[PDB]
Design an enzyme around this catalytic site. Sequence first.
Site, PDB file in Angstrom:
ATOM      1  N   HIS A   1       0.823  -1.188  -0.021  1.00 62.16           N
ATOM      2  CA  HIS A   1      -0.074   0.187   0.062  1.00 62.16           C
ATOM      3  C   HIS A   1       0.887   1.346  -0.046  1.00 62.16           C
ATOM      4  O   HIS A   1       1.924   1.285   0.383  1.00 62.16           O
ATOM      5  CB  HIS A   1      -1.123  -0.021   1.285  1.00 62.16           C
ATOM      6  CG  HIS A   1      -2.218  -0.640   0.938  1.00 62.16           C
ATOM      7  ND1 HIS A   1      -2.606  -1.367   2.078  1.00 62.16           N
ATOM      8  CD2 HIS A   1      -3.122  -0.958  -0.038  1.00 62.16           C
ATOM      9  CE1 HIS A   1      -4.023  -1.884   1.657  1.00 62.16           C
ATOM     10  NE2 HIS A   1      -4.183  -1.596   0.388  1.00 62.16           N
TER      11      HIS A   1
ATOM     12  N   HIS B   1       2.600   2.570   3.011  1.00 61.69           N
ATOM     13  CA  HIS B   1       3.750   1.671   3.528  1.00 61.69           C
ATOM     14  C   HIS B   1       4.713   1.441   2.242  1.00 61.69           C
ATOM     15  O   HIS B   1       6.276   1.369   2.895  1.00 61.69           O
ATOM     16  CB  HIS B   1       3.132   0.326   3.723  1.00 61.69           C
ATOM     17  CG  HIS B   1       2.146   0.109   4.782  1.00 61.69           C
ATOM     18  ND1 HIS B   1       2.517  -0.354   5.902  1.00 61.69           N
ATOM     19  CD2 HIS B   1       0.996   0.486   4.740  1.00 61.69           C
ATOM     20  CE1 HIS B   1       1.410  -0.161   6.844  1.00 61.69           C
ATOM     21  NE2 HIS B   1       0.541   0.215   6.075  1.00 61.69           N
TER      22      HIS B   1
ATOM     23  N   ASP C   1      -0.295  -4.683   8.543  1.00 63.27           N
ATOM     24  CA  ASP C   1      -1.712  -4.314   8.667  1.00 63.27           C
ATOM     25  C   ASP C   1      -2.618  -5.571   8.561  1.00 63.27           C
ATOM     26  O   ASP C   1      -2.250  -6.607   7.639  1.00 63.27           O
ATOM     27  CB  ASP C   1      -2.129  -3.420   7.460  1.00 63.27           C
ATOM     28  CG  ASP C   1      -1.520  -2.001   7.679  1.00 63.27           C
ATOM     29  OD1 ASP C   1      -0.517  -2.047   8.373  1.00 63.27           O
ATOM     30  OD2 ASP C   1      -1.716  -1.146   6.863  1.00 63.27           O
TER      31      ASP C   1
ATOM     32  N   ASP D   1      -1.550  -3.314  14.388  1.00 59.64           N
ATOM     33  CA  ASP D   1      -2.149  -2.618  14.046  1.00 59.64           C
ATOM     34  C   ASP D   1      -3.515  -1.999  14.562  1.00 59.64           C
ATOM     35  O   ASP D   1      -4.396  -2.837  14.982  1.00 59.64           O
ATOM     36  CB  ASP D   1      -2.645  -3.249  12.477  1.00 59.64           C
ATOM     37  CG  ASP D   1      -3.556  -2.412  11.655  1.00 59.64           C
ATOM     38  OD1 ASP D   1      -3.667  -1.204  12.106  1.00 59.64           O
ATOM     39  OD2 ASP D   1      -3.925  -2.786  10.394  1.00 59.64           O
TER      40      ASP D   1
ATOM     41  N   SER E   1     -13.352  -3.534   5.763  1.00 59.80           N
ATOM     42  CA  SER E   1     -12.234  -2.856   6.230  1.00 59.80           C
ATOM     43  C   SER E   1     -11.046  -3.950   5.847  1.00 59.80           C
ATOM     44  O   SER E   1     -11.163  -5.247   5.991  1.00 59.80           O
ATOM     45  CB  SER E   1     -12.248  -2.284   7.539  1.00 59.80           C
ATOM     46  OG  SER E   1     -11.098  -1.474   7.915  1.00 59.80           O
TER      47      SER E   1
ATOM     48  N   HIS F   1      -8.682  -3.406   7.766  1.00 59.30           N
ATOM     49  CA  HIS F   1      -8.306  -3.866   9.046  1.00 59.30           C
ATOM     50  C   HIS F   1      -9.258  -4.373  10.074  1.00 59.30           C
ATOM     51  O   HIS F   1     -10.194  -3.893  10.117  1.00 59.30           O
ATOM     52  CB  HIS F   1      -7.781  -2.106   9.743  1.00 59.30           C
ATOM     53  CG  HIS F   1      -7.000  -1.489   8.730  1.00 59.30           C
ATOM     54  ND1 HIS F   1      -5.454  -1.567   8.661  1.00 59.30           N
ATOM     55  CD2 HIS F   1      -7.198  -0.549   7.547  1.00 59.30           C
ATOM     56  CE1 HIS F   1      -4.876  -0.894   7.886  1.00 59.30           C
ATOM     57  NE2 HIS F   1      -6.074  -0.192   7.205  1.00 59.30           N
TER      58      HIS F   1
HETATM   59 ZN   LIG Z   1      -2.490  -1.432   4.135  1.00 62.14          ZN
HETATM   60 ZN   LIG Z   2      -1.551   0.778   6.220  1.00 58.87          ZN
END
Ligand SMILES: [Zn+2]
Ligand SMILES: [Zn+2]
Lengths: 542, 550, 111
Positions: free
Chosen positions: B71, B74, B159, B190, B361, B363
């Site tokens: 990403h 990152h 993540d 995370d 998500s 996450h």
């Molecule tokens: Zn990510």
């Molecule tokens: Zn991230």
Amino acid sequence: NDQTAVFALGGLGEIGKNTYAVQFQDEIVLIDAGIKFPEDELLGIDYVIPDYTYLVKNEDKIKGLFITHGHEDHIGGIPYLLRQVNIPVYGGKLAIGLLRNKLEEHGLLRQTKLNIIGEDDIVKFRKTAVSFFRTTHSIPDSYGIVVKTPPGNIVHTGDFKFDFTPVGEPANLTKMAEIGKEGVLCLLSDSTNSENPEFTMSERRVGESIHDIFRKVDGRIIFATFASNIHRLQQVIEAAVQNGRKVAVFGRSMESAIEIGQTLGYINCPKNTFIEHNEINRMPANKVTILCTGSQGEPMAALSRIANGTHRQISINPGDTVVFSSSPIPGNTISVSRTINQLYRAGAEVIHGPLNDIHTSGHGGQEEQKLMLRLIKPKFFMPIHGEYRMQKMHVKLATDCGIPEENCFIMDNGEVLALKGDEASVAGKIPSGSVYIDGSGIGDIGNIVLRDRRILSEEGLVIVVVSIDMDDFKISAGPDLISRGFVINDAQELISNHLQKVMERKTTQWSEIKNEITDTLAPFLYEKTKRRPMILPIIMEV
Amino acid sequence: NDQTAVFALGGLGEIGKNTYAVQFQDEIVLIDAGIKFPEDELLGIDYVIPDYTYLVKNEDKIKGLFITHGHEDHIGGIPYLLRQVNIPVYGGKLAIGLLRNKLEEHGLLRQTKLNIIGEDDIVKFRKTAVSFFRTTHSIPDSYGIVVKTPPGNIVHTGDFKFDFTPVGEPANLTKMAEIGKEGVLCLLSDSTNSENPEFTMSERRVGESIHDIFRKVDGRIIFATFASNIHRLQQVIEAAVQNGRKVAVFGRSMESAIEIGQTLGYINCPKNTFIEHNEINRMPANKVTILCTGSQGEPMAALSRIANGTHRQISINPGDTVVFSSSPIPGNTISVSRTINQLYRAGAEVIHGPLNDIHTSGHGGQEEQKLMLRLIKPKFFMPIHGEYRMQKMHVKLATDCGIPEENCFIMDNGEVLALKGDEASVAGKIPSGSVYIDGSGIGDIGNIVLRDRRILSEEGLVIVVVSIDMDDFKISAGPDLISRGFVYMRESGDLINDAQELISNHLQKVMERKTTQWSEIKNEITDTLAPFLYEKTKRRPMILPIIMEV
Amino acid sequence: IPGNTISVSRTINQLYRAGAEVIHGPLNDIHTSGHGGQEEQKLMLRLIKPKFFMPIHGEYRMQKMHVKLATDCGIPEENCFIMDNGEVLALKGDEASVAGKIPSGSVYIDG
Ligand SMILES: [Zn+2]
Ligand SMILES: [Zn+2]
Ligand SMILES: [Ca+2]
Ligand SMILES: [Ca+2]
Ligand SMILES: [Zn+2]
Ligand SMILES: [Zn+2]
């Protein structure tokens, strides 16, 4: 013709600026004349306001301005409108009360006719009459309006939800039902919350949630809400009192709202419940309740100063509980997050969000909107007070309730609705627009100004200034570069060596030099900096 | 020390810039080196980047940069880091793949050592070793990281969420459990979704929701999502194909993601499923599927042009169905609303929001974060990848799972964690900060510069320029007022004319004193002009005097 | 518990009639199941690596749905055996099947 006209000068395709009109021949009734807050993209602006040119070219006809409720997006543009026409204003006791205070700050209080009406008043004109019916909303004393005209009756909902257990006087359902029976040519209904299928939670429920917090919390309570919600303020005070807590108020609008809520009768409290700012630090945590503004993260407001570094009298002590009795208005979500982060960092405890029941919309959702539709019998329907999608979805609600799609008119500001029992249509436009307000300027700042502000703000500027006494064509000072918002010694030389070759030449006018500067500096900066600052040369003749 | 250090150069107290480090004596392992997008208030800026001064002053020690996932927050700051140090980079096949493309645009591809690792690789150094374990996230091929050092083992979750029915390779729970058993000194986990109690819906469920839309829709499907979600792109293609629809792609990042997804093996499709831009208008509505970017309302992106006035090849025909397979990132909510309004106005039908199950998500929420904590046994815990409140709430999760509050360290960028089996603490800071990027200018911009743009953008400016002296200290030209953004010159030429006079009459009385000097004149101009403008205008333009000595 | 719903209602009615205040139901968070739901069941499946899978402790539909969970987690439908009391599962690394019955039933106990 032999029809009634209905239109908006602002309030459609947007939230804000709500100013609506119904006109029949030589008479014309105005409903609301609010203000609108600038979206981030209008760089300098303070407020936005409708273009009143039509109302001006027709002032003689305007029979009155009526006020549904006292929110800024309904009442706020009235000082600006009254600068360009002098017309009589009618509203409930709270709206007129708030507008009074407003007209002082502007000076126009002396020369305007403020009228206070109530449930039962009718104001008649030659061929047109205006009546009222009580509704429920996020501010007290709110009315809807019925404008009677020959071709039929027009109904304006104002802003409304339904609450069967309200803090204030219950919405007049009986009267709404009557109005529909009596016959209704067209309905202008509040579209704002039309995307939400759920039934709006009652203020009674948030009150309960407020009292519950006041029983559980061991320390100070910092309670942030909207000053304009007098009834919510009442519930907070009660909770505080009924828990042996004293109330400190922070924010001119908060004080201002409590004061007017107190007189007028929406707020009642005993003796020494209210406290002065210095008195706070004295008393124990669990007896302090601070009631402030800034629930939207606005960085000048009370709560944000308290968290964000320091405010004068108040700091966050570990154990403090802050309550966001609000919901973030779109685009304020980042502001609010920052505030909350700081509060947490400063050791506070925060109660925010939907799972705690500390807020409700002032605007009804789908079931409520449909209840309106089935209390009034509109032949025709015009969605108001919302962005396009809110209007669209509102219309789906009206078609679902039986009214034919060809009798539903989703309009823009300025379009006009020709209304007659057997026919209706968008029959043409009216002059309309948006008018900007920065400082004391009112429509004083165009787009050509705003394009400059934008350009400046993305790229910066660099000023090249030279003194030349153009008799023996010589550069007697400069070129000096002075820059802001851009990051230039190499450039000061480039524009010197070159500017000298341009003077030796000497058939030099004024505009060609400015151009020779710009046209050779710009590309060098772009080369080095891949940026494009506004480069503007100033020449002095000495 | 005889302890291990752990710290962030960015990524704490914020979403973005994620660059983390673990250092033991003369060896130091970097994890991620992302970029961050400017909040609105940073007027001119394109990207934000961490201050690498510490990494620079210590380049010799840096043993490697490892990449959890690919990403931008990152991987994106890596070109900028590599301009100031040359270090080896390791990552999974997708991350290295995306960074390769990135390093071409920057030129630095030739001179950097790109390494591709997999589940089972261990990279050893003198007194430090790095291993990997597969996780699930909103992008394929994501790893968590275990940095072994003498004083104990450090674990970085990358993540992560949990998905027990993922589209890709299932997260390695077995290996996570082992890692905890083997012993873990500290966990960097995370924090991003820690405020949400619910369990994250599986991509399997959105795929199902995608296929369902493809069966019900009578007309064209315009499908807006995040290019970086290769697996979601796969589900969209399958739906399209399995419904006799052809796919047109719109957006350089979308094409770019599909291309790399195709090679590498995340995306597989038959023959003539893909279509050229011109071919669209030909075929029938219900066989067209347009797959574009701009789900966040970004006004240059595909979808926004399509709705907002016009785009080249594509217009909204009534009956079109647009799908926002995304959720609005904070502050983009207004952008997205505008787009949606236009789409509706243009006769389209829109499928957006949470009640349709077209997004999840990347996450994990609270239960997932707690599952991590009970798979690893962290002596100590450091919340990463989130704003302060996300870090706080994440800590409540960890204490709730039994780890003592005195072993939990909610930190800021730059603070350093001294870690040793029997003791741990925030033992001091490191040089850290943010480095703005406008154009080709790294740190070309300062916070003073942003203050200027800010002042400029709201108020405008007025420049007062004068030429003075033959050494006789007389005013030989001016004062001239030139203004921008303050008032409509073409009309206020009445106002600034009075001002041009005010500052003249007064500037003359100031020259007949010689109890005056350069800085006092600028001040005398400013200090008497400002209040007059405020009087007339209630605005407060940036007023700045320039003096020429002639 | 299913079928006790009428009993519980009666009690609650009486309690109310007798002037009490009752806190019952799901909106107050005063109970949880002792048995995990789908995500938990799937966590099991991904912690163990079953070659084969046999749903237990549930009515037919609960067994069925549990198997959909297992297939969803990658284990092949032909390795999943929804059984009845008494059926027998022949299990060996390379092969498995319901290979016959055993004497089974219900013995009632009255008095
Ligand atoms: Zn990510
Ligand atoms: Zn991230
Ligand atoms: Ca301003
Ligand atoms: Ca720029
Ligand atoms: Zn309102
Ligand atoms: Zn309103």
